C-alpha cells in the first residue's frame, strides 16, 4: 500500500504472471511486466524530486527497478545477496545498495554497488581536462529533465483550460436527478429521472448512447428506442414521476468484454 484517504487505498501489487500492477480505489491503472520470475517483494525509492522507483526483488537472487511516471524497467541486477534502500551517502535522497555474492570473499559488505540510477553511482593519459565538461553535462542533463517535467505539467494545464473553454464556448438548475441502467436479457435499459424544470409537454426529449471509440474500432451504428414513463405516486400536490429510458441490444457491445 502507498496511501489512504476517506475508505480509499492506492496500492501496488504483484502476481504469479510476473506482473506489477497499480490500483487507485479498485482501478487497475498502469500495469507493468517483469523480466524475472517468482517475485518476493517490492520496496520503494525516491531518489529526488519525483523520481519514484519501485525496487522489486525475486526468489532467484535478482532484482529490477521500475520507474514510476513510466511503468518501465529502468534497471535489472543479478545475484544480489541483498538489496537495501536508504541514504548511505548523506545527500538526503534515497539510494539503493546491492550486495553481490559471497563467492568473491568470505565477507558480506565487499562487492557492493550504490546507485540512485542517476548522478550517484559508486562501486567497489591526462584525462582531467575532460572531467568538468562531463560534470557540467550531467548537471545540464539533470536540469533539462527537471525543466521538461514542468513544461509537460504546463501543457496538461493548458489542455484542461481549453476543454473548459470549449464547454463554455458552446454555452445551472439540475434538469436531471440521476442515471440508472439494467440488463434484462439481451437488452440494455438505461433510464434517467427528470425534475420539475423539464416539461415533456413543451419539449421533445431523446436519450442517445454514444460508444467510446477507444473500444469501438468499427462503424457499428448503435441504435436506441426511447420510452417515457409517467407513474403517479400514491394517488389513493400528488407527486408524478416522469422518467426517460432507452433500450438497445447488448451483444454488439460486449466484443471487448467491456464498454463505457
Amino acid at each position: 500500500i502507498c496511501a489512504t484517504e476517506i475508505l480509499r487505498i492506492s496500492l501496488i501489487a504483484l502476481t504469479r504472471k510476473n506482473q506489477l500492477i497499480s490500483f487507485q480505489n479498485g482501478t487497475p491503472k498502469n500495469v507493468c511486466q517483469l523480466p524475472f520470475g517468482d517475485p518476493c517483494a517490492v520496496q520503494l525509492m525516491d531518489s529526488g524530486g519525483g523520481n519514484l522507483f519501485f525496487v522489486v526483488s525475486f526468489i532467484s537472487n535478482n532484482a529490477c527497478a521500475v520507474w514510476k511516471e513510466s511503468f518501465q524497467v529502468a534497471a535489472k541486477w543479478e545475484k544480489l545477496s541483498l538489496v537495501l534502500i536508504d541514504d548511505f551517502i548523506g545527500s538526503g535522497t534515497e539510494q539503493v545498495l546491492l550486495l553481490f555474492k559471497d563467492s568473491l570473499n568470505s565477507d558480506c559488505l565487499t562487492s557492493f554497488k550504490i546507485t540512485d540510477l542517476g548522478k550517484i553511482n559508486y562501486s567497489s593519459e591526462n584525462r582531467y581536462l575532460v572531467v568538468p565538461p562531463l560534470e557540467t553535462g550531467l548537471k545540464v542533463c539533470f536540469s533539462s529533465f527537471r525543466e521538461l517535467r514542468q513544461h509537460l505539467l504546463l501543457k496538461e494545464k493548458i489542455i484542461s483550460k481549453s476543454y473548459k473553454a470549449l464547454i463554455n464556448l458552446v454555452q445551472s438548475e439540475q434538469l436531471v436527478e440521476k442515471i440508472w441502467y439494467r440488463v434484462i436479457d439481451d437488452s440494455l435499459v438505461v433510464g434517467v429521472k427528470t425534475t420539475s424544470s423539464l416539461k415533456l409537454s413543451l419539449n421533445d426529449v431523446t436519450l442517445s448512447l454514444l460508444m467510446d471509440q477507444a473500444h469501438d474500432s468499427r462503424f457499428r451504428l448503435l441504435k436506441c428506442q426511447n420510452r417515457v414513463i409517467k407513474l403517479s405516486t400514491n394517488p389513493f400536490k400528488k407527486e408524478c414521476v416522469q422518467i426517460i429510458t432507452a433500450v438497445t441490444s447488448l451483444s454488439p457491445l460486449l466484443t471487448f468484454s467491456k464498454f463505457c
Binding site: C2, A3, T4, G48, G49, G50, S70, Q72, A74, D87, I89, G90, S91, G92, T93, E94, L117, G118, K119, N121, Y122, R127, Y128, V130, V131, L134, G137, L138, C141, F145, L148, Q150, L152, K155, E156, I158, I159, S162, Y163, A165, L166, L169, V170, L200, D204, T206, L207, S208, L210, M211, Q213, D216, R220, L221, K223, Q225, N226, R227, V228, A246
Partner: protein, 549 residues
Amino acid sequence: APRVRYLAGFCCPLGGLAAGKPRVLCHEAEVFLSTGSELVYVYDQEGGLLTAAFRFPDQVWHLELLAPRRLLYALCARRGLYCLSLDHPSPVIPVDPDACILPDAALCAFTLLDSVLVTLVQGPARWKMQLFEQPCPGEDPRPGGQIGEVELSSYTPHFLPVLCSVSPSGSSGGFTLEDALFGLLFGADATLLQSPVVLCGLPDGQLCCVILKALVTSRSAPGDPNALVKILHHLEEPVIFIGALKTEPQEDVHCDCLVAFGHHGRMLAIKASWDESGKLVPELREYCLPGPVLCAACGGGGRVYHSTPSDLCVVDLSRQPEEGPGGLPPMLCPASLNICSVVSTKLLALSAKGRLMTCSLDMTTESAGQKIKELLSGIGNISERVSFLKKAVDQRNKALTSLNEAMNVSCALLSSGTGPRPISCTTSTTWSRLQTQDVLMATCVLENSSSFSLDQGWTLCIQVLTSSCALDLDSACSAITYTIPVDQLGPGARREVTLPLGPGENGGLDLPVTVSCTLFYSLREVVEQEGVCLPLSRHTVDMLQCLRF
C-alpha cells in the same frame, strides 16, 4: 564531509507526517521536537540521543521556548497551554495538569513577547485574540489576568493560524524591523509608542495586524475590532509562514522585508521604496512559486528555505526594488516539512518520512578513469528518461493540435455564412422493398467541403422523432436514435447512412417525421460532465416526399 546527518527516527503513517503541526526548535545544542502527536522530544545535538520525552495528552499543536527562564510552553489541542521547566526535578515523562496555565480548551494558536503572552482562541463564527500578562519575576509559572481581548470580526469560518511578533528598533522570539518599513505598515502611533505588533495569518488567507499597546480592555472598556485589528493583505489561500529578512545584508538583525507564504505557493514580500513622487510607498510582490508548500524558514541574507512534497527548495530575495521573478533551486534533499534554521549554513528538519536531520550547506591515477565511467553511466541513465518525457510532450502536442482543429470546426459550425459550408448533412427519402412490403428509408449523406479533418473524437448522432404532441398514453416509442463514429473523414469525403422510417408494426406510418443530425466531440477519446454537441441539419419528412406515382 556528509552534508546530511540523521539523528533519530519517528513513527510515520502511510504517506508520511501531515503538515502544519510538526515543529523543531533549537536553543544552543538541544533540539525540541513535536511530530503532531502526544509527545515532545529533546535531543542533545552533540550525540543525537534523546535526553527526554514528554507525554502530553491530545496532539501537541505548537511549541515555544524561553531561554532565560529555561521554560517551554506547549499547546495541547482541546486542552489548553502547558509550561515546563527544562530542569524538571524511563526517559518518558507524563505531564502533570499542575503545569496547565490558562486551560482555555479552545485556543488554536499562541506566541510570546518579553513580559507578555498572546493567544488566539476559536469559538463560534468570530475568533478572538487575547493578551495576558506573564510574570517578569521568577515565580510559580502563572499566566496572570488578561490585559485585553479583541474579536477578529473579519474571520467567519486543519490549517491553524499563525502569529508573528514584530517590534521596531529601540524597544523576544519575533522580528525587529526597520523604522521605514515599520512606519510604512503600522503607522505613527506604533512608531511613537515603540509598540510591538502582532501579525495573525488565518486560513482565509487574510493577514491582520494588531498593535499591543492599543489592546488594553476591560468589562467597562470593550475592545473595538474595526479600530484595533487591521488587515495588511488578503492572500486568497491559507497561510503557512510569516517572516522577515535582511535583504541588502551589505543576532538582532534589523529586517527590511516582510515575507508570507500560502499553502499553494503564493509568496508575498513587502519593502520600503520612497520612490517617484518624493513619498514613502510599499513595494509589494505576490510571487507564485510551485508546489503545495509545507513548511518554510528564513536564513542568512534574504534566503527562504521552503519545502514541497517533491523537494526542499530555496528562494533568494537579495538583489526597481527587490526582484521581478522568483527562481528557486532545489538543494537535493527530500520533502522535509518542519524546517528550522540556525546561523553560525546549518539547518534542521523533520523529513516527511520521520527522520530528524541536520542539513549542512556550504589528481588520482585510474580513479579518474573510474570517474569518467561513473559520469557516462549517469548521463546515460538520465538521457533514457529525458527521451521518454520528450515523447510524452509529442503526444500532448498532438492532443493540442486535434483540439485546435475541433475548436475551428466548432466556430465555423456555430457561425452564420449564408451557406452551410464546413460540414453538411442532407437527408433524402427512398422507397425500397423487404420481402413483400415497401419500406421508406432515409439516406443521410454527410459531406466535408472545408479543409478541416474530423479526426478521432467526433460522432454523428441522428434522431428520428415520430409524431409529436404528448398524449394521454405515453407511446411505446417516442423516438429512435442512432449514433455512428466518424473516423478520418477529411476534406471532400462523404459518408452515407440509410435508416428506416417505415411501418414495422401495423402497416401504419405517421407523418410528419423529423430526422435531425448532430455532432458530438469528446474531450477524453484523444487521451460537471464533459463533451459538446453541435447542431447540423434537421429535415422533416412529409407526405409529398413519401408519395409514389
